[PDB]
Design a protein around this nucleic acid. Structure first.
Ligand SMILES: [Cl-]
Ligand SMILES: [Cl-]
Ligand SMILES: [K+]
Ligand SMILES: [Mg+2]
Ligand SMILES: [Mg+2]
Ligand SMILES: [Mg+2]
Ligand SMILES: [Mg+2]
Ligand SMILES: [Mg+2]
Ligand SMILES: [Mg+2]
Ligand SMILES: [Mg+2]
Ligand SMILES: [Mg+2]
Ligand SMILES: [Mg+2]
Ligand SMILES: [Mg+2]
Ligand code: NA
Ligand code: NA
Ligand code: NA
Ligand code: NA
Ligand code: NA
Ligand code: NA
Ligand code: NA
Ligand code: NA
Ligand code: NA
Ligand code: NA
Ligand code: NA
Lengths: 119, 81, 56, 46, 65, 194
RNA sequence: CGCACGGAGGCGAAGAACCACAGAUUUCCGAAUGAGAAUCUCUAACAAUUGCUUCGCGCAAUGAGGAACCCCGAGAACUGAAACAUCUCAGUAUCGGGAGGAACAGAAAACGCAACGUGAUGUCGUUAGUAACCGCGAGUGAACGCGAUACAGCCCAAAC
RNA sequence: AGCUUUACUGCAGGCUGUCGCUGAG
């Protein structure tokens, strides 16, 4: 809401999450806002996901602007438990980062592009 | 657990009810209803209770006036004790 | 009418009665509150420090 | 006045307490009920 | 006295219950005789009947009935 | 590297600026419509909560409490008083609002015990504080090497005896040297002059 | 076979009485909790508030008491000042809330005999009626240090 | 001690300015 400045089409979100699942099985991913944050800061982040149903919003407010001043691409997910399931967790997850994809490097790249284009 | 019947209330007036109306008077537990007083009496003396009248006395105990059926004879029932 | 003897004759109203909780005849049956133990007003028993000398 | 079943038990007890010290107790203790209450001269609770 | 602890334990759950209802009755008839101001009393027994009943009930509890 | 938490913390250093500012202007609208004590599933200030002992675990509870702003709500004297004691308007209570909030919460949860609390803002006429409480009876806590201490009997009603953090501060026990002559070991033993 | 020394009777060598420990029983009201009620009554009950939760009162918690002591809040006036208002009585009396067998305090953002020094905290003795306050009136009034008592030092948050 | 008032000193209350809640042109 306050940290969300653009809306991601249901279809885009689906592709994005899909890439995430293969990312965990083929490449590397970080689950949890703290681990995600360190990715963006350490640079090892290629694509980060942020849920929109987070309360308090404080937990994630920093992701957007932080990512921007680090070039790291980011996309929004409506559900919190969906991003958690995608990342492979039995619980939900406020945010996650694809640390070096895997057989999704192509897709991710496109998603990153589709989003940049989504302004 | 408390018993229903405490003891026979034997007094002149109690006798008249016995000799003249086939009634037995008892001191019963004050938590006992007319219906319980009825059963208790039939089970202890093997008789048929027709009607029971109660009174909460100024002695702190509950008095029950129990009428027996023409079948039974108050005098004889009371005589065995 | 004198406030004394002549006004004593109408006093046939029952107020304070034996209290179910403390046993004292202080249960005000109109207020449903014991003036002695607080029953009906307080779960805690009525008690004050002024019921004895200050240093005791 | 209309008394309840409980009030009645209490009045009953008060009447009983209002009896004398049996004669044998006087002997058993080689020789007074300080709780003697008259209906008129005294006043019960409630 | 006339009824000891052992004797109560040597009984069976059903024998105690029968012994109980027995004493209760002796007790009731004792009181009844007392209610009639009956002098053929024996004060020590009406007192015993109460203790015996207490014992039987105590054991019923101990033995699990 | 900075922890994600550090961002929550740094945001609250200035609750009147940035996104947090807009967040507050929004939440308080819902808050002003909630009750005196509202249990909440997650702390509004995660860094602060964890910093104070919080743990996403069974038996750990949080609740937002709102208390009115200002001085004592005092009644004017109804008998003789020397001028010194005739005041009403300027008298203030000796217990701070945050401590009043901790007590109101602990009473709402009779079985729980206050662990700590923190401010989450205020509007023109009231303040909100989030209080962290603990279930001293839940085995999830009885077996926690970091919190099981709160389970001891002598920790019963700890907030009502000022053993809370905000309590001890409000009691002037912060300083260990000069200035704490009348405060330590207790206000009462020092004749109530602190 | 209570105090309690009567009358009658009974119990105890099957070891009673009596004492110690443990157990059984333990009515009604009472925090009083199914609901109501001056200790009773009406038709299955953790009432109420909570935690966990198989989201079912299933598992748990709270409530009230106690000689004072203890801790956290609210807080007079008579009185003293030879009147009286600040001051004093006094953070006393009294009130609200709550813990324990003791409470509270407690391992320095200390002290500041200024040091090349001391080393968690209570308490006792002293420091001292000193410093400080005060219609600079009446009055009020510490601390560091020292000598003792007893000693004990640790755990998170975050970084990774 | 009760009462009075342009006695002394204060305290509620009312009126009024200002700060916070409090924002856009
Ligand atoms: Cl508490
Ligand atoms: Cl030193
Ligand atoms: K004065
Ligand atoms: Mg009738
Ligand atoms: Mg008059
Ligand atoms: Mg008589
Ligand atoms: Mg009830
Ligand atoms: Mg004077
Ligand atoms: Mg002390
Ligand atoms: Mg002078
Ligand atoms: Mg002083
Ligand atoms: Mg010093
Ligand atoms: Mg005068
Ligand atoms: Na009788
Ligand atoms: Na009378
Ligand atoms: Na509590
Ligand atoms: Na002070
Ligand atoms: Na008992
Ligand atoms: Na309970
Ligand atoms: Na339940
Ligand atoms: Na004088
Ligand atoms: Na004078
Ligand atoms: Na002065
Ligand atoms: Na006068």
């Amino acid at each position: 809401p306050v940290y969300v400045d653009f809306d991601v089409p249901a279809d885009l979100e689906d592709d994005a999450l899909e890439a995430l699942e293969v990312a965990r099985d083929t490449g590397a991913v970080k689950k949890g806002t703290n681990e995600t944050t360190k990715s963006i800061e350490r640079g090892s982040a290629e694509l980060v996901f942020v849920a929109e149903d987070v309360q308090p919003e404080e937990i994630v407010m920093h992701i957007p602007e932080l990512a921007d001043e680090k070039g790291v691409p980011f996309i929004f997910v409506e559900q919190q438990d969906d991003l958690g399931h995608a990342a492979g967790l039995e619980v939900g997850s406020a945010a996650a980062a694809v640390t070096d994809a895997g057989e999704a490097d192509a897709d991710v790249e496109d998603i990153a592009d589709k989003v940049e284009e989504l302004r | 657990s408390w018993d229903v019947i405490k003891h026979p209330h034997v007094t002149e007036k109690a006798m008249n009810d016995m000799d003249f109306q086939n009634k037995l008077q008892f001191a019963v537990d004050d938590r006992a209803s007319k219906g319980e007083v009825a059963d208790a009496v039939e089970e202890q003396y093997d008789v048929t209770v027709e009607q029971v009248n109660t009174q909460n006395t100024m002695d702190g105990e509950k008095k029950a006036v129990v009428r027996l059926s023409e079948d039974d004879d108050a005098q004889e029932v009371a005589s065995r004790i | 009418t004198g406030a004394g003897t002549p006004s004593q004759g109408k006093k046939n109203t029952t107020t304070h009665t034996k209290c179910r909780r403390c046993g004292e005849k202080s249960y005000h049956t109109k207020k449903k509150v014991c003036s002695s133990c607080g029953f009906g007003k307080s779960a805690k028993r009525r008690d004050y420090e002024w019921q004895s000398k200050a240093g005791e | 006045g209309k008394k309840s079943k409980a009030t009645k038990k209490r009045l009953a007890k008060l009447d009983n307490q209002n009896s004398r010290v049996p004669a044998w107790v006087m002997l058993k203790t080689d020789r007074r009920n300080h709780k003697r209450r008259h209906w008129r001269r005294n006043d019960t609770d409630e | 006295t006339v009824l000891h602890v052992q004797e109560i334990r040597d009984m069976t759950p059903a024998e105690r219950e029968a012994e109980l209802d027995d004493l209760k009755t002796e007790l009731l008839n004792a009181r009844a005789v007392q209610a009639a101001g009956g002098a053929p009393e024996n004060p020590g027994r009406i007192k015993e009947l109460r203790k015996a009943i207490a014992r039987i009930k105590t054991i019923q509890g101990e033995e699990g009935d | 590297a900075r922890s994600a938490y550090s961002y929550i913390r740094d945001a609250w250093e200035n609750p009147g600026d940035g996104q947090l500012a807009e967040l507050q202007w929004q939440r308080q609208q819902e808050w002003r419509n909630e009750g005196a004590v509202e249990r909440i599933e997650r702390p509004t200030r995660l860094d602060k909560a964890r910093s104070q002992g919080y743990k996403a675990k069974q038996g750990v509870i949080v609740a937002r409490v709102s208390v009115r702003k200002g001085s004592a709500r005092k009644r004017r004297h109804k008998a003789g008083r020397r001028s010194k004691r005739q005041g009403v308007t300027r008298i203030t209570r000796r217990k701070d609002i945050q401590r009043v909030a901790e007590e109101r919460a602990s009473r709402t949860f009779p079985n729980l015990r206050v662990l700590n609390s923190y401010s989450v803002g205020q509007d023109g006429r009231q303040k909100w504080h989030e209080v962290i409480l603990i279930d001293p009876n839940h085995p999830a806590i009885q077996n926690d090497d970091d919190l099981s201490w709160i389970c001891a009997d002598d920790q019963a009603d700890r907030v009502f005896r000022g053993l809370t953090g905000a309590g001890r501060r409000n009691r002037g026990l912060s300083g260990k040297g000069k200035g704490s002559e009348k405060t330590r070991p207790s206000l009462r033993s020092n004749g109530g002059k602190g």
